[PDB]
Amino acid sequence: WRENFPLCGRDVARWFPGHMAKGLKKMQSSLKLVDCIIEVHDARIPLSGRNPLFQETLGLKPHLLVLNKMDLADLTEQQKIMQHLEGEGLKNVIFTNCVKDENVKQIIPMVTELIGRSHRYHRKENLEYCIMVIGVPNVGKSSLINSLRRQHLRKGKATRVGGEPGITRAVMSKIQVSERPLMFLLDTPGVLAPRIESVETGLKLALCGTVLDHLVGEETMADYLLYTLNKHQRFGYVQHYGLGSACDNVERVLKSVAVKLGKTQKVKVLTGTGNVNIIQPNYPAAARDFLQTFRRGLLGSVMLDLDVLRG
RNA sequence: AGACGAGCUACCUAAGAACAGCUAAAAGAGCACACCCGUCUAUGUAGCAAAAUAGUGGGAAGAUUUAUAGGUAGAGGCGA
RNA sequence: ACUCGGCAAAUCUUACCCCGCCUGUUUACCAAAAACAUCACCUCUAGCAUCACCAGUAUUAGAGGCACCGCCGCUCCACGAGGGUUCAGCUGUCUCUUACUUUUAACCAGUGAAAUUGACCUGCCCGUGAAGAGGCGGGCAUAACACAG
RNA sequence: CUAGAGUCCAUAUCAACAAUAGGGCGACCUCGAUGGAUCAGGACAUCCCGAUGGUGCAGCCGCUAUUAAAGGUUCGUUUAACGAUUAAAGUCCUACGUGAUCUGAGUUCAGACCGGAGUAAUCCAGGUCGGUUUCUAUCUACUUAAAUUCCUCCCUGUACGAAAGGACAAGAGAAAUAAGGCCUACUUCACAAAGCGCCUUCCCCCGUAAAUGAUUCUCAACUUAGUAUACCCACCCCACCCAAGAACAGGGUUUAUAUAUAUAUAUAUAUAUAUAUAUAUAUAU
Numbered sequence A: 001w002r003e004n005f006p007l008c009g010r011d012v013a014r015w016f017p018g019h020m021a022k023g024l025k026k027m028q029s030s031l032k033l034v035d036c037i038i039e040v041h042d043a044r045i046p047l048s049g050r051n052p053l054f055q056e057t058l059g060l061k062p063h064l065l066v067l068n069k070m071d072l073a074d075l076t077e078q079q080k081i082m083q084h085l086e087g088e089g090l091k092n093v094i095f096t097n098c099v100k101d102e103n104v105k106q107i108i109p110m111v112t113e114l115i116g117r118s119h120r121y122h123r124k125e126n127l128e129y130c131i132m133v134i135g136v137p138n139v140g141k142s143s144l145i146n147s148l149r150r151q152h153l154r155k156g157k158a159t160r161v162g163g164e165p166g167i168t169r170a171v172m173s174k175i176q177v178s179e180r181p182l183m184f185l186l187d188t189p190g191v192l193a194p195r196i197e198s199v200e201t202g203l204k205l206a207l208c209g210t211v212l213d214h215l216v217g218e219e220t221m222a223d224y225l226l227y228t229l230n231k232h233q234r235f236g237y238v239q240h241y242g243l244g245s246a247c248d249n250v251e252r253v254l255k256s257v258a259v260k261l262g263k264t265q266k267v268k269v270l271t272g273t274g275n276v277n278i279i280q281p282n283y284p285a286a287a288r289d290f291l292q293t294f295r296r297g298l299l300g301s302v303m304l305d306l307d308v309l310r311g
Numbered sequence B: 001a002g003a004c005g006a007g008c009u010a011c012c013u014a015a016g017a018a019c020a021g022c023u024a025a026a027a028g029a030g031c032a033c034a035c036c037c038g039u040c041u042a043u044g045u046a047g048c049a050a051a052a053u054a055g056u057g058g059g060a061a062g063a064u065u066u067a068u069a070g071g072u073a074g075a076g077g078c079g080a
Numbered sequence C: 001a002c003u004c005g006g007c008a009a010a011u012c013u014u015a016c017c018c019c020g021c022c023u024g025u026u027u028a029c030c031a032a033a034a035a036c037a038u039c040a041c042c043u044c045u046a047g048c049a050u051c052a053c054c055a056g057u058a059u060u061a062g063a064g065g066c067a068c069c070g071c072c073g074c075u076c077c078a079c080g081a082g083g084g085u086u087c088a089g090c091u092g093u094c095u096c097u098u099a100c101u102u103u104u105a106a107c108c109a110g111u112g113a114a115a116u117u118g119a120c121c122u123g124c125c126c127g128u129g130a131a132g133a134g135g136c137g138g139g140c141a142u143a144a145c146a147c148a149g
Numbered sequence D: 001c002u003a004g005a006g007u008c009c010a011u012a013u014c015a016a017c018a019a020u021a022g023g024g025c026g027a028c029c030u031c032g033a034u035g036g037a038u039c040a041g042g043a044c045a046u047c048c049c050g051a052u053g054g055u056g057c058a059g060c061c062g063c064u065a066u067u068a069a070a071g072g073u074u075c076g077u078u079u080a081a082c083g084a085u086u087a088a089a090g091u092c093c094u095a096c097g098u099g100a101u102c103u104g105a106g107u108u109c110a111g112a113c114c115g116g117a118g119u120a121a122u123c124c125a126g127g128u129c130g131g132u133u134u135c136u137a138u139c140u141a142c143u144u145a146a147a148u149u150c151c152u153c154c155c156u157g158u159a160c161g162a163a164a165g166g167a168c169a170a171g172a173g174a175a176a177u178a179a180g181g182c183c184u185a186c187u188u189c190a191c192a193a194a195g196c197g198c199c200u201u202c203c204c205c206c207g208u209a210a211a212u213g214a215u216u217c218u219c220a221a222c223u224u225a226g227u228a229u230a231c232c233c234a235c236c237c238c239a240c241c242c243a244a245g246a247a248c249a250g251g252g253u254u255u256a257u258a259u260a261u262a263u264a265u266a267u268a269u270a271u272a273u274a275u276a277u278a279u280a281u282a283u284a285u
């Protein structure tokens, strides 16, 4: 297939509105009433999508790494993954499944130990523990809070959860998630880096749904996700869409998808005789459905940081 | 404290009436008149009107709409 | 590309998220919804005649909570003048307004209101002042007079 | 002020501890109705254009200073960030400058939900959805000639520079904006109006640089440099027409545990009752 993805003329797709800048401002102010920091990140991109603006700005507190969405990620190289964070500077890495509440029960005992091996300073007399949840948008921060309440507090959903970026607009109030020990969680908006270090990282972030797909163009990551499937040699889309065989031509794949689902759109094409309205297969609809199917997990586990892991 | 009010409206009782056409199927079904309602915009703001007009909208065989007579009265009635 | 917003107008498009099962109902006159009712499910009380319950009798009746179905607190169809986003098209929304028609409009003839009104022979600049001056101080301007903005 | 940076070196620029000047918490008036659009007036403490000193100014770029407010100071995404540009995308005052010109939010309201507090009713400088002020103008005030900038070319690949590089001044072409007009074509359209179309657009700026020269560019006597015109102007009218016009005016008209198969047995325990010497026994759950 294609040895490498063409990145000529493409820039990173940043998304830093004011709703997260004001939210990021609150974290510096609200740092006084927190004990531990938990960073929730997607397991599909354990290394690339992390926001550097969470270390030198917040800092000063124990840091816990929680890797969500294990079902959508391939954990064959799991041991090599944690070895990388250990070299990178992270000691506590936990994989979790928020939609199923897997491995969530081990968060609380480790969080208590991390706070114990620390200095609460003015919060020494507080029996209550306050934990702040951080990460990029759409990684399951709100789902993590609800999962902890269901497992420990045995209560209902307390934070709104959606499949769209920017569900949690601002820093919510403290929400109890457990009784033994008595401890709350702070729901915070997802914060992206104002400047993405590499174009490939931006596409990876767009692949997992952390950023809006429309501002990047549904076609560019349809090919990119098709490119990654070919690299992994999974070919889960071949039998899902009833395609004849694995292909690399992005336009032809979307043509089959539009044919398969009977989606057609009429567009204006600039000809030498003027503008002509013709009906064509609905490529944006095909791209959106193809992207949604991968996100739902019907195309198998993926790992977007395999190349950076090997070197 | 003592009288007067359910001819508006909330609800109930008695016995009445209305719902073209098309698709469908024996549907608190769909499109869509009559009819009921009042989402949005504009006009109006001592106005036609102490809540209206134009366009655009929801419902429109049902927990539908509606005429007549009767009942529940203020420390109360009635209230999806 | 206007804009808080594709509001309006043109055109007669697709997809996604949040919330509410759907359906229906309400603040007559600033809220039609995520609010309420709602089938379904759960809790409590009652062993019984002659105006309600009821001319009924535990598979019944009354008082409530939740809001169908399904799974072991969570998903799923369908639907919504509900709140956000998007594809294509569409257009004076805009770049950037222009032209024409009708009504108001102005003049002529008739009829003829309302708020308002301490008295007025009712100018500008700077300063002053119960601290924001047509009316006070120092300068300047200054025949009278109606109509349309 | 001259410690200290700037290889040396206070004063090309930066700057310590200090000092001297200037700028816009109180309850004094009113408790008898903020953002953007449009239009902008003004200050200079000048973002761009201009003139002139210094430079760690070779030339191009730069830094700093003096003078100058006539002219100009973009379009987009989200709710300041960066996207592309520009000679530049200035700091402010003007009751948010301006809501009897208009229009998002907030100060908040009648409905509701989530998180939190409260026995409750009900609340929250947490988040979210929805959500009505109107006006006929009386008075004051007002309601029709001088242009700027960018780019390209020539000078010139010249001066300067070892090269890398790369200008001034004068002149020419083209473009944009702004002001004032127009309909021959294009276009919206048709006896016409209009732009997307076309035409015209003209003065200086005084910071300093220097001669001579006394008690040396001179708050000494003195010399030099940069130290306006155009437009408008005469005075039948009934009626009709008009490129003139609101009217008027204007122009045109040639229970727990163990065992046996939920039951049974055993032990231990607790509850209750009785009897006997707090203790012991019996019965049952």
Ligand SMILES: Nc1nc2c(ncn2[C@@H]2O[C@H](COP(=O)(O)OP(=O)(O)NP(=O)(O)O)[C@@H](O)[C@H]2O)c(=O)[nH]1
Residues within 6 Å of the ligand: A068, A069, A070, A071, A072, A096, A097, A098, A099, A100, A136, A137, A138, A139, A140, A141, A142, A143, A144, A160, A161, A162, A163, A164, A165, A166, A167, A168, A169, A188, A189, A190, A296, A297
């Ligand atoms: N398949 C799968 N889906 C998951 C998992 N965890 C979360 N999701 C889903 O992914 C979506 C994103 O979760 P969410 O908690 O809303 O993320 P968020 O951090 O709150 N996003 P934001 O910062 O914008 O508020 C939700 O629809 C959630 O159900 C997982 O492990 N697997």
Ligand SMILES: [Mg+2]
Residues within 6 Å of the ligand: A141, A142, A143, A160, A161, A167, A168
């Ligand atoms: Mg969230």
Ligand SMILES: [Mg+2]
Residues within 6 Å of the ligand: none
């Ligand atoms: Mg019919």
Ligand SMILES: [Mg+2]
Residues within 6 Å of the ligand: B029
């Ligand atoms: Mg029906």
Ligand SMILES: [Mg+2]
Residues within 6 Å of the ligand: none
């Ligand atoms: Mg509405």
Ligand SMILES: [Mg+2]
Residues within 6 Å of the ligand: none
């Ligand atoms: Mg826009």
Ligand SMILES: [Mg+2]
Residues within 6 Å of the ligand: none
């Ligand atoms: Mg509309």
Ligand SMILES: [Mg+2]
Residues within 6 Å of the ligand: none
């Ligand atoms: Mg309805």
Ligand SMILES: [Mg+2]
Residues within 6 Å of the ligand: C027
């Ligand atoms: Mg109402």
Ligand SMILES: [Mg+2]
Residues within 6 Å of the ligand: none
């Ligand atoms: Mg409800």
Ligand SMILES: [Mg+2]
Residues within 6 Å of the ligand: none
């Ligand atoms: Mg008259």
Ligand SMILES: [Mg+2]
Residues within 6 Å of the ligand: none
């Ligand atoms: Mg100056």
Ligand SMILES: [Mg+2]
Residues within 6 Å of the ligand: none
């Ligand atoms: Mg005003």
Ligand SMILES: [Mg+2]
Residues within 6 Å of the ligand: none
């Ligand atoms: Mg003009």
